Design a protein around this motif. Structure first.
Motif, PDB file in Angstrom:
ATOM      1  N   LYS A 119       0.807  -1.194  -0.011  1.00  0.00           N
ATOM      2  CA  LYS A 119      -0.288   0.398   0.023  1.00  0.00           C
ATOM      3  C   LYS A 119       0.766   1.550   0.035  1.00  0.00           C
ATOM      4  N   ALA A 120       1.981   1.069   1.187  1.00  0.00           N
ATOM      5  CA  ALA A 120       2.875   1.840   0.864  1.00  0.00           C
ATOM      6  C   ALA A 120       3.288   2.183  -0.610  1.00  0.00           C
ATOM      7  N   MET A 121       3.888   1.550  -0.996  1.00  0.00           N
ATOM      8  CA  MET A 121       4.632   1.681  -2.590  1.00  0.00           C
ATOM      9  C   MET A 121       3.188   2.292  -3.416  1.00  0.00           C
ATOM     10  N   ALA A 122       2.478   1.375  -3.607  1.00  0.00           N
ATOM     11  CA  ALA A 122       1.222   1.930  -4.668  1.00  0.00           C
ATOM     12  C   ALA A 122       1.016   3.383  -4.546  1.00  0.00           C
ATOM     13  N   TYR A 123       1.444   4.035  -3.092  1.00  0.00           N
ATOM     14  CA  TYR A 123       1.657   5.363  -3.364  1.00  0.00           C
ATOM     15  C   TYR A 123       2.478   5.747  -3.449  1.00  0.00           C
ATOM     16  N   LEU A 124       3.834   5.786  -3.472  1.00  0.00           N
ATOM     17  CA  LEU A 124       5.179   6.215  -4.143  1.00  0.00           C
ATOM     18  C   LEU A 124       4.966   5.785  -5.627  1.00  0.00           C
ATOM     19  N   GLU A 125       4.152   5.245  -6.168  1.00  0.00           N
ATOM     20  CA  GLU A 125       4.041   3.977  -7.590  1.00  0.00           C
ATOM     21  C   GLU A 125       3.039   6.012  -8.638  1.00  0.00           C
ATOM     22  N   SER A 126       1.819   6.101  -7.956  1.00  0.00           N
ATOM     23  CA  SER A 126       1.007   7.046  -7.960  1.00  0.00           C
ATOM     24  C   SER A 126       2.079   8.677  -8.720  1.00  0.00           C
ATOM     25  N   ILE A 127       3.467   8.880  -7.553  1.00  0.00           N
ATOM     26  CA  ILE A 127       3.596   9.719  -8.104  1.00  0.00           C
ATOM     27  C   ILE A 127       5.385   9.388  -8.970  1.00  0.00           C
ATOM     28  N   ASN A 128       5.750   7.948  -8.941  1.00  0.00           N
ATOM     29  CA  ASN A 128       6.424   7.831  -9.983  1.00  0.00           C
ATOM     30  C   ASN A 128       7.958   8.320  -8.626  1.00  0.00           C
ATOM     31  N   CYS A 129       7.672   8.517  -7.381  1.00  0.00           N
ATOM     32  CA  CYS A 129       8.489   7.952  -6.610  1.00  0.00           C
ATOM     33  C   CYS A 129       9.412   6.575  -6.442  1.00  0.00           C
ATOM     34  N   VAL A 130      10.687   6.624  -6.860  1.00  0.00           N
ATOM     35  CA  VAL A 130      11.192   5.290  -6.217  1.00  0.00           C
ATOM     36  C   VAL A 130      12.116   5.434  -5.362  1.00  0.00           C
ATOM     37  N   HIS A 131      12.384   4.008  -4.240  1.00  0.00           N
ATOM     38  CA  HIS A 131      12.223   4.167  -3.141  1.00  0.00           C
ATOM     39  C   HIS A 131      13.637   3.461  -3.109  1.00  0.00           C
ATOM     40  N   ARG A 132      14.198   1.801  -3.901  1.00  0.00           N
ATOM     41  CA  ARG A 132      14.907   1.641  -3.942  1.00  0.00           C
ATOM     42  C   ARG A 132      15.733   1.179  -2.666  1.00  0.00           C
TER      43      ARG A 132
END
Ligand SMILES: CN(c1ncccc1CNc1nc(Nc2ccc3c(c2)CC(=O)N3)ncc1C(F)(F)F)S(C)(=O)=O
Length: 261
Positions: A119-132
């Motif tokens: 769920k957290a990654m889905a939010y980051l994915e929505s703003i094309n934020c790459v966590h790594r």
């Protein structure tokens, strides 16, 4: 009175060493007079200009994220020494937590933690934020019911990285999908290290052959299939995090229904 005065924050023990500097345990007194336990990130005095800039840059991103499954930034003191005041999750790293509690944890819980991170990654994915840095060493346990994705990757974690990241230093939301599935493997393995039987140099060759991490003993077959979709060699063929939330929600429901909870 908005913001945070330094006097509102009292430091206690050192918690450890982050990339930019020491992290302390402490107490923050808020505007309602409540005592809040905090993790206070610092930057070394003797660090390069570019490192200071990056410390503050990452903090401002974290300040704007407000997700139940991402570590919470409470405030920033900009005046030197610059402190980033985070919420303290005293149970610490998920990998250690899993090792410690392996004999009481149910599979439904391991799937829950996967889902929460997803769920957290889905939010980051929505703003094309790459966590790594989606790995159990960088997930915090807020409570038995709640995990939190940690700070963005300093980007070497070869055994967690997609083929395109290893071959070309390419990082995208799809390489995060690859890494997230490795994280799921860690979780279902109670914190075992991926490819602990290989050396770093050997990994890409194995990956190039189509060899992948084996199914953890307690991993439901349905969830393993989902992991193997995330480890498609071609980034374009991998599920998106928004799809995985739906898939993992279904796996979670099934495991709950089998456990009769
Ligand atoms: C200890 N360090 C960390 N190791 C791994 C992940 C995170 C941190 C530090 N950050 C945090 N750490 C915690 N809690 C925490 C952590 C690690 C332990 C404990 C608590 C107890 C313990 O034994 N180890 N809660 C919130 C945060 C924050 F800021 F992200 F919100 S370090 C190497 O100094 O960076």
């Amino acid at each position: 009175q908005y913001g945070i005065a330094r006097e509102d924050v009292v430091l206690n023990r050192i918690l450890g060493e982050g990339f930019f500097g020491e992290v302390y345990e402490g107490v923050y007194t808020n505007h309602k007079g409540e005592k809040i336990n905090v993790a206070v990130k610092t930057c070394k005095k003797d660090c390069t200009l570019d490192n200071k800039e990056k410390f503050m840059s990452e903090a401002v991103i974290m300040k704007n994220l407000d997700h139940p499954h991402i570590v919470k930034l409470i405030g920033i003191i900009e005046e030197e020494p610059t402190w980033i005041i985070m919420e303290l999750y005293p149970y610490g790293e998920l990998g250690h937590y899993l090792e410690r509690n392996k004999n009481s944890l149910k599979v439904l819980t391991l799937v829950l933690y996967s889902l929460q991170i997803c769920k957290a990654m889905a939010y980051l994915e929505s703003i094309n934020c790459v966590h790594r840095d989606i790995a159990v060493r960088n997930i915090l346990v807020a409570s038995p019911e709640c995990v939190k994705l940690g700070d963005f990757g300093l980007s070497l974690p070869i055994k967690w990285m997609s083929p395109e990241s290893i071959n070309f230093r390419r990082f995208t939301t799809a390489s995060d999908v690859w890494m997230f599935a490795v994280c799921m493997w860690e979780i279902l393995s109670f914190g075992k290290q991926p490819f602990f039987w290989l050396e770093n140099k050997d990994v890409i060759g194995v990956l190039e052959k189509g060899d992948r991490l084996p199914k953890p003993d307690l991993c439901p077959p349905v969830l393993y299939t989902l992991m193997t979709r995330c480890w498609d060699y071609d980034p374009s063929d991998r599920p998106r995090f928004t799809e995985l939330v739906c898939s993992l929600s279904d796996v979670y429901q099934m495991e709950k229904d089998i456990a009769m909870e």
